[PDB]
Ligand code: B12
Ligand SMILES: *[C@@H]1O[C@H](CO)[C@@H](O[C@@H]2O[C@H](CO)[C@@H](O[C@@H]3O[C@H](CO[C@H]4O[C@H](CO)[C@@H](O)[C@H](O)[C@@H]4O)[C@@H](O)[C@H](O[C@H]4O[C@H](CO)[C@@H](O)[C@H](O)[C@@H]4O)[C@@H]3O)[C@H](O)[C@H]2NC(C)=O)[C@H](O)[C@H]1NC(C)=O
Ligand SMILES: *[C@@H]1O[C@H](CO)[C@@H](O[C@@H]2O[C@H](CO)[C@@H](O[C@@H]3O[C@H](CO[C@H]4O[C@H](CO)[C@@H](O)[C@H](O)[C@@H]4O)[C@@H](O)[C@H](O[C@H]4O[C@H](CO)[C@@H](O)[C@H](O)[C@@H]4O)[C@@H]3O)[C@H](O)[C@H]2NC(C)=O)[C@H](O)[C@H]1NC(C)=O
Ligand SMILES: *[C@@H]1O[C@H](CO)[C@@H](O[C@@H]2O[C@H](CO)[C@@H](O)[C@H](O)[C@H]2NC(C)=O)[C@H](O)[C@H]1NC(C)=O
Ligand SMILES: *C1O[C@H](CO)[C@@H](O)[C@H](O)[C@H]1NC(C)=O
Ligand SMILES: *[C@@H]1O[C@H](CO)[C@@H](O)[C@H](O)[C@H]1NC(C)=O
Ligand SMILES: *[C@@H]1O[C@H](CO)[C@@H](O)[C@H](O)[C@H]1NC(C)=O
């Protein structure tokens with residue numbers, strides 16, 4: 001098969017697609033679009049048999065208008081977007097006998113090279129700035145900034161100038177999208193608008209991906225910021241009650257011989273839980289080449305919940321405590337695509353088994369509390385001790401005999417009370433070693449904050 | 458164009474009166490009507506003079522943004538000076554902002570009235586708001602509601618025609634962009650049978666389409682729609698005077714846009730005088746799964762004399778038989794809204810109402826108009842928009 005394309009827009013079908021492609025192919029495509037223009041490739045879908053040297057099945061794309069080629073691609077990995085130097089592109093697909101899959105869908109479109117701002121950076125030097133800066137940036141402009149660096153380090157971006165159009169309500173006019181990887185769908189560090197200087201941004205990788213969009217009207221000076229490529233560190237302290245993170249280069253295969261680290265801790269007294277939209281690493285009996293260790297607790301010293309490797313997708317991993325540590329290490333040679341990890345923080349049926357003291361805060365806190373919760377914490381006092389209370393913040397919905405939203409307290413089996421309002425409840429003490437806290441919340445709110453409280457033994 | 462066949466005109470002056478008759482001293486004063494009868498030329502000068510005086514005396518603080526726009530506009534068509542209401546709305550609209558792009562589409566129906574009425578007093582002074590509004594409306598991404606699409610196009614058409622001489626090439630281009638995008642969304646809802654969106658939304662939409670600067674790709678079959686609406690009046694679908702008020706203008710070949718051109722004292726014509734059942738059972742569920750931790754799924758069955766009993770009788774009779782089906786009601790320009798069932802009340806800050814559906818698909822008449830069939834299952838879900 002194979003075809004050549006003139007259209008400004010089009011799609012590109014793997015022969016087998018929607019399922020699956022034939023073994024042993026030699027097919028080729030050629031995409032040509034008007035001059036002074038560029039080809040932008042999207043990538044709806046893409047399965048292929050995987051291969052470290054990338055030999056068996058694979059897809060490569062030469063930059064026709066130029067020497068060199070954009071690369072060869074097997075597996076699941078392939079940047080959601082690619083963009084040519086010229087107005088012409090080679091597109092060869094080539095396979096082998098054993099092993100096939102749903103193939104790939106893949107869109108593309110023409111793009112003027114004037115209106116086309118996209119710029120890559122490496123030098124460990126912040127020369128980077130909104131279009132036209134300090135003059136006013138243009139309208140209907142879009143503009144992208146990838147910045148990659150040395151494989152050890154992290155990126156840390158500071159802002160010098162930043163004045164962008166204000167936000168209508170929770171609607172953005174004009175913004176600066178910052179992502180944690182090197183691709184348009186990597187975790188979201190933040191979107192930034194208006195007139196305040198963004199905080200210092202810090203990565204968890206050596207790649208950063210940025211986009212500045214502007215709408216039909218209204219213009220300002222824009223921004224200017226710089227960056228440090230120093231630490232050789234990678235991973236980070238992950239502070240939100242829920243979030244998402246990335247094995248370097250993802251969805252591209254990761255770096256080798258690196259040991260990345262991530263510590264989940266946010267809301268006091270509520271356990272985290274993991275999950276993966278995608279796992280792949282070196283398969284290994286007994287596991288140990290390149291692996292991913294989770295740890296019930298703040299450091300490696302804590303009880304190791306699991307070590308993972310290979311190609312299979314894990315069962316969610318409920319930490320049993322406040323913190324959760326995660327370390328991953330790779331040996332030189334061999335690299336899988338990597339992982340992507342949704343992680344939520346739970347509160348159903350947790351137990352503090354042993355702790356001298358601590359804090360209990362409703363997950364978001366001080367963010368207003370999630371609708372529809374059946375929350376059940378239980379602090380246990382060793383031996384024949386007890387637990388003193390004291391509250392620090394309280395702000396629930398109101399009355400109806402505390403039948404709308406509420407919070408209960410328990411001394412073992414006995415109830416000590418049911419609370420709500422913005423009234424702070426009394427200190428107290430269990431005559432038991434068991435101490436249960438129940439917070440039941442319904443489906444609406446003015447967005448009352450939650451609660452916070454202390455504990456003893 | 459699709460001006461009403463003179464043959465069919467009697468059919469029109471019909472409802473015109475049937476609407477004007479709804480105006481009494483205890484009726485809820487309905488601006489939409491006074492605009493409608495001013496636009497169409499009022500028969501009942503006693504009625505018109507009555508309902509004007511009511512709107513004049515209205516208290517500014519009981520008026521939401523939409524109310525207020527409607528009112529300014531309604532007064533304007535009676536050649537009465539709103540003056541003060543305009544100041545107020547103007548101040549209220551500087552400070553105006555929507556919620557979020559995932560927020561509901563009708564959230565823009567209210568502001569569409571404000572802008573429209575405001576643009577009509579002062580276009581140049583309205584520009585900022587009109588821009589803020591368009592940018593946002595466009596960006597919003599909830600499921601298109603036609604009623605709102607239609608009103609937005611009036612507000613937005615008016616502004617589009619009043620770009621101050623000199624203004625950066627940009628306003629018009631933004632307004633028009635949104636205007637086209639909206640008109641596409643609308644033609645896309647014209648049924649293979651003349652209706653745009655649905656019946657009660659059709660009148661608004663007719664206005665919209667016959668006024669936007671850029672027509673839809675697929676050309677709109679006006680004559681079809683205007684004929685469809687006409688047979689549909691023979692069929693008694695337009696008894697509720699508010700709904701009359703929302704098609705009367707199109708039928709009289711007008712839009713809220715012509716309000717500033719209303720003339721006063723034409724001296725209108727007298728529209729000449731034109732002169733068993735076994736009670737049924739309906740299954741009535743009332744379900745709360747949203748408010749507090751005290752909620753309901755309680756179903757029930759009742760008898761309602763003949764058909765021709767409207768859903769409200771079912772409600773009242775359920776209320777009477779069983780105290781759990783108590784409900785409380787509240788009056789509006791469209792009529793009686795069920796505001797609370799079982800002490801669970803709609804609340805604005807929760808964006809939370811009582812929705813009535815037939816088994817599973819939502820109703821589209823108020824309980825005081827809707828007529829249930831011999832073994833129908835009506836459920837009332839407390840839910841949100
Ligand atoms: C947004 C909206 C609602 C919202 C209103 C949000 C709010 N609280 O402001 C809620 C409240 C979500 C709503 C409810 C219903 N409404 Co509605 N509503 C609309 C819409 C699109 C906007 C009207 C508006 O904002 N007015 C702007 C201001 C300036 O005027 P207003 O006097 O303050 O308007 C008030 C009334 O319109 C009232 N309202 C809104 N919908 C309905 C429906 C009925 C039957 C009544 C009596 C009142 C009412 O709420 C507004 C604030 O009080 C219109 C479309 C239209 N063309 O009118 C319909 C519309 C009038 N409502 C309609 C319907 C069918 C319903 C529902 C019956 C649907 C259902 N399955 O329950 C329910 C009624 C349930 C009940 N318990 O009574 C239909 C007409 C009904 C009819 N008898 O012909 C309309 C025409 C939409 C349509 N084209 O079908 N909807
Ligand atoms: C990008 O971001 C930075 C801010 O983070 C901004 O850069 C500053 O711009 C301001 C004003 O435009 C500068 O302040 C000015 O300093 C003048 C002196 O020049 C030199 O001497 C001083 C002191 O030793 C240095 O700090 C300075 O950097 C120079 O080397 C003063 O004469 C002025 O202060 C006067 O201004 C106001 C009224 O307007 C008075 O009330 C003051 O008290 C005083 O009389 C002048 O304000 C500042 O020097 C710049 N900072 C930098 C770059 O270090 C940019 O504005 C911003 N935008 C762009 C496009 O670059
Ligand atoms: C009577 O009244 C009740 C209350 O009004 C209704 O209850 C809700 O119904 C909706 C479904 O229509 C539910 O909301 C949706 O949930 C979907 C899937 O579940 C979510 O929850 C889990 C975890 O708890 C998530 O992990 C998951 O990914 C979901 O987010 C979502 O797909 C929906 O998202 C979409 O809808 C919204 C608008 O509502 C969009 O704007 C989004 O962008 C998106 O496309 C949504 O979140 C809700 O869970 C129900 N809960 C309850 C108990 O109220 C009844 O449906 C109603 N019955 C009838 C027929 O009247
Ligand atoms: C809080 O959740 C826990 C479960 O994590 C409940 O604790 C007890 O659980 C045992 C089995 O684990 C049950 O037999 C009992 O019903 C529970 N004991 C007591 C004294 O109640 C506990 O019930 C929960 N509190 C709630 C949901 O009311
Ligand atoms: C229908 O019949 C019931 C008894 O079957 C009667 O009580 C009721 O009056 C009728 N419906 C109404 C209230 O008009
Ligand atoms: C993969 O094998 C090696 C990589 O070191 C390279 O020389 C070779 O050309 C690659 N595949 C091909 C095209 O044979
Ligand atoms: C995260 O927290 C630890 C413990 O305080 C600290 O030592 C480390 O420097 C932090 N890591 C980062 C991302 O800076």
Ligand SMILES: *[C@@H]1O[C@H](CO)[C@@H](O)[C@H](O)[C@H]1NC(C)=O
Nearest residue numbers: 352353354355380381382383
């Ligand atoms: C808590 O103490 C240690 C952890 O330091 C743990 O091993 C022990 O089992 C716990 N104690 C109780 C009372 O369960």
Ligand SMILES: *[C@@H]1O[C@H](CO)[C@@H](O)[C@H](O)[C@H]1NC(C)=O
Nearest residue numbers: 387388389427428429456457
């Ligand atoms: C716990 O609090 C009570 C308050 O009545 C007090 O009597 C007791 O001494 C406290 N115990 C501790 C842990 O100090």
Ligand SMILES: *[C@@H]1O[C@H](CO)[C@@H](O)[C@H](O)[C@H]1NC(C)=O
Nearest residue numbers: 399400401402403404751800
């Ligand atoms: C609490 O529930 C509601 C509050 O309105 C009330 O009807 C009920 O009787 C109350 N119960 C008590 C306090 O006995």
Ligand SMILES: *[C@H]1O[C@H](CO)[C@@H](O)[C@H](O)[C@H]1NC(C)=O
Nearest residue numbers: 283284285286287288289307
């Ligand atoms: C892991 O090492 C090998 C896996 O092939 C196995 O024989 C051994 O028993 C396992 N346990 C040890 C010794 O770590």
Ligand SMILES: [Ca+2]
Nearest residue numbers: 057096098099
């Ligand atoms: Ca193969």
Ligand SMILES: [Ca+2]
Nearest residue numbers: 165215217218
């Ligand atoms: Ca802008």
Ligand SMILES: [Ca+2]
Nearest residue numbers: 331332333334
């Ligand atoms: Ca390796």
Ligand SMILES: [Ca+2]
Nearest residue numbers: 405442444445
């Ligand atoms: Ca709540």
